Amino acid sequence: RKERLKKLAKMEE
Amino acid sequence: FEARQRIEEKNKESSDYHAKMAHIVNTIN
Amino acid sequence: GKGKPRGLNSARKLRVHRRNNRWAENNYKKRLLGTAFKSSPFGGSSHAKGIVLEKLGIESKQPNSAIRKCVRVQLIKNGKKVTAFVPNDGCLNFVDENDEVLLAGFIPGVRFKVVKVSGVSLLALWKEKKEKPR
Amino acid sequence: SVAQIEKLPDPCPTPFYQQKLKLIYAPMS
Amino acid sequence: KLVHDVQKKQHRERSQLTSRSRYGFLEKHKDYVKRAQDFHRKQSTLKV
Amino acid sequence: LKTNDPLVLSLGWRRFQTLPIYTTTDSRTRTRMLKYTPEHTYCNAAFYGPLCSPNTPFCGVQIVANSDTGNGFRIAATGIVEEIDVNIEIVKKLKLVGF
Amino acid sequence: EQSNKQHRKAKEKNTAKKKLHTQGHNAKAFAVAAPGKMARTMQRSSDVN
Amino acid sequence: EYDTWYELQKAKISKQLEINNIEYQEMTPEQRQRIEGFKAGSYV
Amino acid sequence: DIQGPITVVSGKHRRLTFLECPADDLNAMIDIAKIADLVLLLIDGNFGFEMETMEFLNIAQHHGMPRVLGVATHLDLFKSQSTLRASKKRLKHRFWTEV
Amino acid sequence: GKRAINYQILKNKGLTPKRNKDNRNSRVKKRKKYQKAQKKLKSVRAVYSGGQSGVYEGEKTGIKKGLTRSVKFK
RNA sequence: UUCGGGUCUUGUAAUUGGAAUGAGUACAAUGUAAAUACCUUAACGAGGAACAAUUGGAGGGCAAGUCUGGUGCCAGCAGCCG
Ligand SMILES: [Mg+2]
Ligand SMILES: [Mg+2]
Ligand SMILES: [Mg+2]
Ligand SMILES: [Mg+2]
Ligand SMILES: [Mg+2]
């Protein structure tokens, strides 16, 4: 979950 | 005393570097 | 009636009208008059030779910064001075003043990148597969 | 530092120069 | 991606000095950050 | 290559051996001494010897005698003279330790 | 708060066909027969130059 | 009027080299070596 | 017998100076690379590239590349025509990398 | 007496990223990719695996009570 | 999207066996005006099968390391340099 959240932070940004 | 002088020197160097950078970016465009 | 002749023997008028109207296209005009190359950055060439004048970003503090990868190059063909990228700061060491470079299409205003230096590809040098001949 | 220097006639003149006015010149050997 | 594999080599951790071994493991930035937040959590629950 | 390691240079018409010191700019803030040359990139090197105009390329060899030739490649370093000065201010990180 | 509608002016700028003759000569007459070979051969020549 | 900027630079150099030749052709032989020195190709 | 430079007429208005560089000295390699207008790079086809061949090319590339011509010798030692062609092809392409 | 060039000089590969062996043979690479895909398809949905072998020993992975995989007509 | 949910022979950075073959080398023969090569073929030729496949793209992580800014421990740049 933590890794996936950090990845979406790139997708959102 | 050297503490006071170094801050003065570092301040002078930082201002000069930024001024040089402003010139470079201005020239390129 | 659609505003055009339609008689079975009206071929001449359609042909001559078409040729006159065909010149309206900017694309057609450039193709026939051979002026499609003015807009090209290199004036029709796929690459551009130049002289490395100065490496502007050498004094930058931040490594691999956008400023660091820029070099002013003087196009040999017409003498106009322009600016180009280097792929990375590592390759910047290879490039030096007064040495030939081949430029190709790619901070705004910068539209070129270096692909060869002194007749040798930068990527070839960067992968340590070649030495720059001087 | 060169003590002295002087020019000498060409010991292996090229034919064009010669006719204007032996093909091998190997003094060391 | 103009980075070499050598560009991305791992940098290994050092450890406590042998003379200082009795004082315990040599904490690092990652180790410090855990105890710092836990410390903050107590005072926030203590100040309330 | 190692700092303060003898190295035979070839500058212009002249060949000679010196004791270079390899340094880095440290984000263009200082001239810090390096311990070894970078594995696959350039670095600033300062050495004492006859001056030459900039843009003068040169090559380096650590061994010239045939007795020690071995089989490995004998060309050690390649570079370009960048400045000529009568002074340099290389510095080394000296970190004090307390408990 | 009244904004009248713009009067779209009659074109005084040269029309496209007129622009061809706005130089010393008639631009339509000095053309080539094979524009396809025009572009290809030049591009090779430019890089050879 | 040269087509490319390259030709202009080469023209300037060639013109200058051409000028050097004329002055030396005007020049007396004993003077010439005093000014120019021993040119390349001389056996010395 | 040939010793040292040899100057010979090569045309109506052209002359050449031949100089057999000592193969066993790296110092002699360096200075020749700085004055050699032309290099006749001798290569043993049967054995292949050698250090002295590769070393000299690097010296030439860094001191200003002069004209280089590769000369392959000892090709008669090959006993098969097919293997001779393959060796010639491999050598030529590798030579095309340096030059 | 003769100093021959080593492997590094002859091939002149220079610096290249590490590459797994499967790229050397495309057929092998696709073989491993497919068999990997089959394993995943089992996770996505059940797939027939020859039916019953041996006596019926029950459902090994368990029965779920309130769960239906039923695709309803609306 | 959090909330979590669905599924079962999966993984090993582990050991180990003898069978197969042509890239190449090469007696010979075939091929050819004469040759090279192809198709044949005695004898050699595999475990890192080092007999060492390439060209591009996407994304990490690490230091007693370096640079910059500041509502403390942070953030940005980046990191072949400890
Ligand atoms: Mg109608
Ligand atoms: Mg035609
Ligand atoms: Mg074959
Ligand atoms: Mg090739
Ligand atoms: Mg075969």
Distances (CA, A) of C68 to B21, C17, C119, F54: 11, 58, 23, 22
- Pick the closest to residue J3 from I49, I19, F37 (CA basis): I49
Number of E–F residue contacts, CB under 8 Å: 4
Tokens of F46: 């300062």
* Cβ pairs D/H, distance under 8 A: 13
Among residues C110, C107, C134, C106, the alpha carbon closest in space to that of C120 is found at C134
Shortest Cα distance, chain C CAs vs residue I53, angstroms: 15
The Å distance, CA of C36 to C1' of K2, is 57
Question: Quick check: H14 contacting D, CB < 8 Å?
Answer: no
DSSP secondary structure letter of residue I73: E
List the Cα angle D7/D10/D14 in 5-degree steps: 145
Q: Which of F75, H38, E1 is nearest to I55 (CA)?
A: F75
Residue C20's contacts (CB-CB under 8 Å, 6 or more residues apart) are G17
Between G17, G38, G49, which is nearest C23 by CB? G17
Residue in I95, I94, I70, C133 with CA at minimum distance from that of residue J11: I94
Specify the DSSP class assigned to residue C37: T
User: Which residues contact residue F91 at a Cβ distance below 8 angstroms, ignoring those fewer than 6 apart?
Assistant: F30, F31, F32, F33
I14 touching D (Cβ < 8 Å):
yes
Ligand nearest to the CA of I93: 4
Q: Is I61 exposed, middle or buried (0-12, 13-18, 19+ CB in 10 A)?
A: buried
The secondary element (H helix, E strand) that includes residue A4 is helix A2-12
**Is the shortest CB-to-strand distance from A4 to strand K under 7 Å?**
yes
Domain residue limits at C126: 1-134
Give the total number of structural domains in chain C: 1
Cβ within 7 Å of strand K: which of F 56-95? 93, 95
Q: Which residue of C has its CA nearest to F44?
A: C93
| Per-residue tokens: G37 | 């070979």
Resolution of the coordinates in A?
3.9
Check CB contact of C47 with chain G, cutoff 8 Å. Answer: yes
Beta strands in F12-72 (DSSP E): 14-18, 21-24, 32-33, 44-46, 57-61
Q: Do residues F60 and I63 touch, judged by C-beta distance below 8 A?
A: no
Residues within 5 Å of ion ligand 2, judged at the Cβ atom: G 34
I56's tokens: 């000299």
Q: Do chains D and I touch (3 or more CB pairs under 8 A)?
A: yes
Only one residue has tokens 């670095």, namely F43
List the J39 CA – K4 C1' distance (angstroms).
24
Picking from D2, F88, B25, F45, the residue whose alpha carbon sits closest to that of residue C110 is B25
DSSP assignments along chain G, one per residue:
---PPP--PPP-SPPHHHHHTSSSS-TTTS--S-HHHHHHHHHHHHHH-
Nucleotides of chain K in contact with protein CB (under 7 A) are 2-4, 6-11, 24-27, 35-37, 49-50, 52-64, 66-69, 72-74, 76-82
Among F29, F40, F41, the residue with its CB nearest the CB of C61 is F29
Chain C and chain G share a number of CB contacts under 8 A equal to 40
Task: Evaluate if the CB of J50 falls below 7 Å from strand K.
Answer: no
Interface contact flag, F74 I27, Cβ < 8 Å: no
Q: What SS3 string covers chain E?
A: CCCCCHHHCCCCCCCCCCCCHHHCCCCCHHHHHHHHHHHHHHHHHHHC
Nearest residue to K26, CA vs C1'? I80
Helix, strand, coil fractions of chain B, as percent rounded to 5: 95, 0, 5
Q: Which amino acid is present at I53?
A: T
Instruction: Find the I96 Cα to ligand 5 centroid distance in Å.
Output: 28
Interface contact flag, C56 B24, Cβ < 8 Å: yes
Strand K proximity: list residues 89-108 of C with CB under 7 Å: 89-90
Ligand nearest to the CA of I81: 3
What stretch of H or E contains J58? none
For residues F69 and F74, what is the distance between their CA atoms, to the nearest angstrom?
7
Distance in Å, residue I81 CA to nucleotide K34 C1': 15
Task: Tell me phi and psi for residue I61, to 5 degrees.
Answer: -65, -30
Q: Which residues contact F88 (CB under 8 A, 6 or more apart)?
A: F31, F46
Burial I2-16 (b: 16+ CB within 10 A, else e): eeeebbebeeeeebe
- Distance in angstroms (rounded) separating the CA atoms of residues I8 and I18: 8
Chain I residues 59 to 98 with C-beta below 7 Å from nucleic strand K:
79-83, 85-86
**Class of residue D19 by CB neighbours under 10 A (exposed 0-12, middle 13-18, buried 19+):** exposed
- Cβ of residue A2 lies below 7 Å from strand K: no
Q: Are J3 and F71 inside 8 Å of each other by CB?
A: yes
Those residues with Cβ within 8 angstroms of residue H8's Cβ, 6 or more apart along the chain or in another chain: H2
Which is nearest to C107 in space by CA: C73, C56, C59, C61? C56
Measured at the alpha carbon of residue F93, what is the angle toward residues F88 and F96, in degrees to the nearest 5? 140
| Strand I67-73 with I38-44, pairing | parallel
Whole-Å CA distances, F18 to C75, F8, F81, F87, J38: 40, 7, 14, 16, 65
Asked whether strand K has any atom less than 7 Å from the CB of F28, the reply is no
Cα J24 from chain centre? 17
CB contacts of J15 in chain E (<8 Å) are 4-6
CB H30 within 8 A of CB H37: no
Q: Which H or E element spans position B2? A: helix B2-28
Q: Looking at the CA of C2, which ligand is closest?
A: 1
Hey, is F10 helix, strand or coil? strand
CB contact under 8 A, F71 and I54: no
Taking the C1' atom of K80, which residue's CA lies nearest?
E7
What residues of J are in contact with residue F73 (Cβ under 8 Å)? 9
Put simply, the answer to whether D25 touches I13 (Cβ < 8 Å) is: no
> Whole-angstrom Cα distance, residue E43 to residue C46?
67
Contact D28, I4 (CB under 8 A): yes
CB of C87 within 8 Å of a chain E CB? The answer is yes
Give me ligand 2 centre to Cα C40, in Å: 26
| Residue E17: half-sphere exposure toward Cβ, Cα within 13 Å | 5
Contact check, Cβ <8 Å, I62/C134: yes
